[PDB]
Amino acid sequence: NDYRDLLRMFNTNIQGKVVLECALVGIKGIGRRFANVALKKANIDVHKRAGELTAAEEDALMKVLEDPLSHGIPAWMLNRNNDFESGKDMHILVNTIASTHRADLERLRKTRCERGVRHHHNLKVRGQHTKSTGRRGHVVGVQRKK
Amino acid sequence: DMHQKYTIIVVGKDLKLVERYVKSIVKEGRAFGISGPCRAPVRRLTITTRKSPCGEGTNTWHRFELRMYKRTFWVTCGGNDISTILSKTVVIPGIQVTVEV
Amino acid sequence: PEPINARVIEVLGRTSSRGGITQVKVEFMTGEKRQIIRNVIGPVRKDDILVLMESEREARRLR
């Protein structure tokens, strides 16, 4: 078996043990909206060593991620359905996840709102469980300027 | 005689009261070809309220249950004959008699 | 040195202050008929063979 461990793509090492499927959801997690709805099949083998997979199969896989709609993946699997930008449905890849997170957080700051104060002050947003639940780590409403 | 089929249904809280009304309908109907009485599965009406009006104490709860038993009697008779049967039947106040044509 | 087989001729009473212990009157299953009360834990009934004893330790009937 030419298991071929590593075979890193997208600046993220993979494994000679991981099946061809977990290898993408395990591409840092960031960069793969998973549930393997299309990932389970794609054109790649269901259950084999992920290094053994041929480059040609990997390259076709890279293309299906690059244009999800062309593969035939339904829009619901993809993450950015409507987009607040040019409003165009798009997938999110590894680097864009944290760039888009900056886009979501920095937009929040420029458009001041309760949902932004509940992130700049580090309060958990939505749940309102900053009352009696998360002693955990000290990520709770504290304060002490003077 | 336009022999209509009548279904008679009786819903009552007390078994002692229900059996007496059931016996009268069977007793009155021997002349009119009465089908024997059908006993319903008990209809439980449980209500559970913590007994204490205030919140003090290990809440203890009152399970208040009302049992409904319904009785089905099929009769094939004229519209008047049930009325003649009615005078003979002993009427217990508040017990319900349902005439289903 | 071997645990000596014993015959539980009869069960006496439950003691130890928690009732846990049930000291029983015993006799030797193997030996010149040595018979002495011994301290037992767990369920015991007459004619039981207790093969878990060193013989020297001696218990008593006052309780």
Binding site: - | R50, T58, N59, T60, W61 | -
Partner: protein
């Protein structure tokens, strides 16, 4: 499912000669016997077919202890409704064993043959009084309570 007229509701005509009830853990199995060609099928399903394959060996206990000439030829159609899964198998086992007993019928010492089956398996002829108990106020389950904070 629950004490209905399902005793014979499914089958019309071909009156099956024997009617024998078997019950374990709220599971009702009425055994119908026609003394045929070795049909021990219960729930219109083969004896070998079972929810737990390992459990089937227990339901073959009259077959091993009592003569096989009995099960060599018989006919069966059993309506089992109710029970989680394993409750159904012991109820089935009560049904079929009583069904074989009902077939012996005429020999007066039918009980003596049946008691060899009781001696190997008690409750194979008897129904248990074990039934689910109820919770009470302050109790998550039948025999417990919310954990008490102070003794």
């Amino acid at each position: 499912d629950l004490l209905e007229r399902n005793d014979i509701e499914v089958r019309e005509r071909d009156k099956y000669t024997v009617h024998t009830l078997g019950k374990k853990k709220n599971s009702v199995a009425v055994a119908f016997v026609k003394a045929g060609k070795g049909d021990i099928l219960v729930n219109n399903v083969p004896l070998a077919l079972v929810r737990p394959e390992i459990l089937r060996t227990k339901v073959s206990e009259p077959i091993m202890i009592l003569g096989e000439s009995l099960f060599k030829g018989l006919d069966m159609n059993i309506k089992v409704a109710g029970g989680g899964h394993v409750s159904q198998i012991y109820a089935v086992r009560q049904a079929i064993s009583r069904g074989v007993l009902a077939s012996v019928k005429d020999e007066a010492a039918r009980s003596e043959l049946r008691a060899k089956l009781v001696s190997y398996d008690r409750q194979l002829v008897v129904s248990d009084p074990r039934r689910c108990e109820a919770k009470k106020f302050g109790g998550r389950g039948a025999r417990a309570r919310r954990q008490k904070s102070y003794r």
